[PDB]
Design an enzyme around this catalytic site. Structure first.
Site, PDB file in Angstrom:
ATOM      1  N   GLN A  63      30.866 143.815  60.437  1.00 54.62           N
ATOM      2  CA  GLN A  63      32.116 144.021  60.678  1.00 54.62           C
ATOM      3  C   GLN A  63      33.203 144.090  59.340  1.00 54.62           C
ATOM      4  O   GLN A  63      33.660 144.903  58.744  1.00 54.62           O
ATOM      5  CB  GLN A  63      32.687 142.635  61.603  1.00 54.62           C
ATOM      6  N   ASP A  64      33.235 142.918  58.471  1.00 52.00           N
ATOM      7  CA  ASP A  64      34.134 142.643  57.477  1.00 52.00           C
ATOM      8  C   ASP A  64      33.229 142.455  56.283  1.00 52.00           C
ATOM      9  O   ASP A  64      32.139 141.644  56.543  1.00 52.00           O
ATOM     10  CB  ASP A  64      35.116 141.359  57.614  1.00 52.00           C
ATOM     11  N   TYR A  66      32.165 140.647  52.791  1.00 48.23           N
ATOM     12  CA  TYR A  66      32.228 139.073  52.253  1.00 48.23           C
ATOM     13  C   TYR A  66      33.464 139.072  51.484  1.00 48.23           C
ATOM     14  O   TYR A  66      33.650 140.063  50.663  1.00 48.23           O
ATOM     15  CB  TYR A  66      31.100 138.774  51.464  1.00 48.23           C
ATOM     16  N   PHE A  77      26.163 142.317  54.868  1.00 51.08           N
ATOM     17  CA  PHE A  77      25.318 140.790  54.536  1.00 51.08           C
ATOM     18  C   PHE A  77      24.598 140.565  52.994  1.00 51.08           C
ATOM     19  O   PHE A  77      24.388 139.566  52.966  1.00 51.08           O
ATOM     20  CB  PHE A  77      24.153 140.848  55.579  1.00 51.08           C
ATOM     21  N   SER A  88      24.781 133.330  56.857  1.00 46.61           N
ATOM     22  CA  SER A  88      24.358 134.677  57.688  1.00 46.61           C
ATOM     23  C   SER A  88      23.089 134.998  56.908  1.00 46.61           C
ATOM     24  O   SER A  88      22.144 135.346  57.922  1.00 46.61           O
ATOM     25  CB  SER A  88      25.524 135.558  57.803  1.00 46.61           C
ATOM     26  N   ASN A 123      29.410 148.072  57.042  1.00 42.17           N
ATOM     27  CA  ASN A 123      30.385 147.341  57.756  1.00 42.17           C
ATOM     28  C   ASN A 123      31.281 148.400  58.457  1.00 42.17           C
ATOM     29  O   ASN A 123      31.476 149.532  57.791  1.00 42.17           O
ATOM     30  CB  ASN A 123      31.184 146.705  56.771  1.00 42.17           C
ATOM     31  N   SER A 166      29.247 140.838  69.213  1.00 43.47           N
ATOM     32  CA  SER A 166      30.145 141.351  70.153  1.00 43.47           C
ATOM     33  C   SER A 166      30.853 142.631  69.722  1.00 43.47           C
ATOM     34  O   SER A 166      30.896 143.766  70.137  1.00 43.47           O
ATOM     35  CB  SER A 166      30.957 140.639  71.171  1.00 43.47           C
ATOM     36  N   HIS A 187      25.011 137.364  66.694  1.00 41.33           N
ATOM     37  CA  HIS A 187      25.519 137.424  65.336  1.00 41.33           C
ATOM     38  C   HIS A 187      24.659 136.306  64.607  1.00 41.33           C
ATOM     39  O   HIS A 187      24.419 135.074  65.099  1.00 41.33           O
ATOM     40  CB  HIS A 187      26.863 137.226  64.873  1.00 41.33           C
ATOM     41  N   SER A 189      25.373 134.524  61.957  1.00 43.10           N
ATOM     42  CA  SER A 189      26.313 133.267  61.599  1.00 43.10           C
ATOM     43  C   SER A 189      25.757 132.054  62.249  1.00 43.10           C
ATOM     44  O   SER A 189      25.579 132.026  63.405  1.00 43.10           O
ATOM     45  CB  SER A 189      27.909 133.657  61.747  1.00 43.10           C
ATOM     46  N   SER A 192      26.773 131.079  65.931  1.00 34.26           N
ATOM     47  CA  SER A 192      26.193 132.043  66.882  1.00 34.26           C
ATOM     48  C   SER A 192      24.669 132.243  66.834  1.00 34.26           C
ATOM     49  O   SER A 192      23.966 132.650  67.971  1.00 34.26           O
ATOM     50  CB  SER A 192      27.143 133.213  66.832  1.00 34.26           C
ATOM     51  N   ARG A 195      22.416 131.365  69.813  1.00 34.42           N
ATOM     52  CA  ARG A 195      22.775 131.957  70.853  1.00 34.42           C
ATOM     53  C   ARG A 195      22.044 133.280  71.188  1.00 34.42           C
ATOM     54  O   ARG A 195      22.332 134.271  72.037  1.00 34.42           O
ATOM     55  CB  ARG A 195      24.226 131.937  71.359  1.00 34.42           C
TER      56      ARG A 195
HETATM   57  O1  FCF Z   1      30.825 139.548  66.978  1.00 37.98           O
HETATM   58  C1  FCF Z   1      30.371 138.224  67.163  1.00 37.98           C
HETATM   59  O2  FCF Z   1      29.969 137.804  68.497  1.00 37.98           O
HETATM   60  C2  FCF Z   1      30.352 137.141  66.270  1.00 37.98           C
HETATM   61  C3  FCF Z   1      30.183 135.698  66.615  1.00 37.98           C
HETATM   62  C4  FCF Z   1      30.025 134.859  65.691  1.00 37.98           C
HETATM   63  C5  FCF Z   1      30.248 134.960  64.414  1.00 37.98           C
HETATM   64  C6  FCF Z   1      30.626 136.455  64.039  1.00 37.98           C
HETATM   65  C7  FCF Z   1      30.992 136.839  62.482  1.00 37.98           C
HETATM   66  N1  FCF Z   1      30.813 135.689  61.754  1.00 37.98           N
HETATM   67  O3  FCF Z   1      31.327 135.996  60.508  1.00 37.98           O
HETATM   68  C8  FCF Z   1      31.125 135.282  59.331  1.00 37.98           C
HETATM   69  C9  FCF Z   1      29.680 135.096  58.857  1.00 37.98           C
HETATM   70  O4  FCF Z   1      29.590 135.713  57.769  1.00 37.98           O
HETATM   71  N2  FCF Z   1      29.841 136.910  57.740  1.00 37.98           N
HETATM   72  C10 FCF Z   1      29.031 137.670  56.591  1.00 37.98           C
HETATM   73  C11 FCF Z   1      29.202 139.340  56.730  1.00 37.98           C
HETATM   74  C12 FCF Z   1      28.971 139.937  55.462  1.00 37.98           C
HETATM   75  C13 FCF Z   1      28.958 141.185  55.974  1.00 37.98           C
HETATM   76  O5  FCF Z   1      28.786 142.096  55.073  1.00 37.98           O
HETATM   77  N3  FCF Z   1      29.402 142.032  57.207  1.00 37.98           N
HETATM   78  C14 FCF Z   1      29.633 141.110  58.138  1.00 37.98           C
HETATM   79  O6  FCF Z   1      29.828 141.548  59.115  1.00 37.98           O
HETATM   80  N4  FCF Z   1      29.355 139.746  58.018  1.00 37.98           N
HETATM   81  C15 FCF Z   1      30.654 137.217  65.027  1.00 37.98           C
END
Ligand code: FCF
Length: 223
Positions: A63-64, A66, A77, A88, A123, A166, A187, A189, A192, A195
């Protein structure tokens, strides 16, 4: 050193002249004038530098990036040495250790070794304002990264898409599962991971699917 990988540029450059893309470029440029934006300009498209577009075998959608200092470098990641792996990524490594008997923890968080093997670490949003999660959301990146996903869907076969959480599942929802493999779980993290992600065994499962595609497997310990 290239800003944008040659083979990727050839197939994605149709996006560049589109109104949304010019607008996105302007948005990011204005953000960089007034704020610190991650990753630095030379690392925004690292995902295009590590392998040829034709050599992609596996796609992990994030998604996003860091948003902390020194963390984001253009692969989802991943964190370059000597930055400690975030929670994560420690979870990804933990699952690997139980999934694959012989996986060894590399002692760093740099996933360049996977990217070079054709593991696309994309991402959905490619920039972020320092310390501000989702600050660059819905500014144009989603449309561009959708185009990346659409290109691979239409122009390659037997890819393994790994959709964790999701958001990634939504972004991969229109992937042709007659022509590509799709694995889904929670995910990684801490909030989650229990789960579904712990015990998902996507890494061993990926290599089995790759064999069925007539492709050599990923060496997950090659990092
Ligand atoms: O989409 C979901 O269901 C879901 C559920 C729980 C948590 C999250 C996302 N948490 O993000 C914070 C954890 O750190 N993220 C690191 C990351 C680094 C990266 O380069 N790309 C990411 O998507 N994520 C998504």
């Amino acid at each position: 050193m290239e800003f944008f990988g040659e083979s990727w540029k050839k197939h994605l450059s149709g996006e560049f002249g589109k109104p949304y893309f010019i607008k996105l470029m302007g948005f990011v440029a204005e953000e960089r004038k007034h704020y610190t934006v991650y990753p630095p300009p030379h690392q925004v498209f690292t995902w295009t530098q590590m392998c040829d577009i034709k050599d992609v075998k596996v796609v992990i959608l994030g998604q996003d990036p860091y948003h902390g200092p020194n963390q984001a470098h253009g692969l989802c990641f991943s964190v370059q040495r000597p930055v400690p792996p975030p929670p994560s990524l420690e979870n990804i490594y933990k699952e690997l250790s139980t999934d694959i008997e012989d996986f060894v923890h590399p002692g760093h968080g740099d996933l360049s070794g996977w990217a070079k093997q054709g593991v696309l670490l994309l991402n959905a949003v490619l920039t972020v304002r320092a310390h501000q999660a989702n600050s660059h959301k819905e500014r144009g990146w989603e449309q561009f990264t959708d185009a990346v996903v659409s290109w691979l869907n239409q122009n390659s076969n037997g890819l393994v898409f790994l959709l964790w959480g999701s958001y990634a599942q939504k972004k991969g929802s229109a992937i042709d599962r007659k022509r590509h493999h799709v694995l889904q779980t929670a995910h990684p993290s801490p909030l989650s991971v229990y789960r579904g992600f712990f015990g998902c065994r996507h890494f061993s499962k990926t290599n089995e699917l790759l064999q069925k595609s007539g492709k050599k497997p990923i060496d997950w310990k090659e990092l």
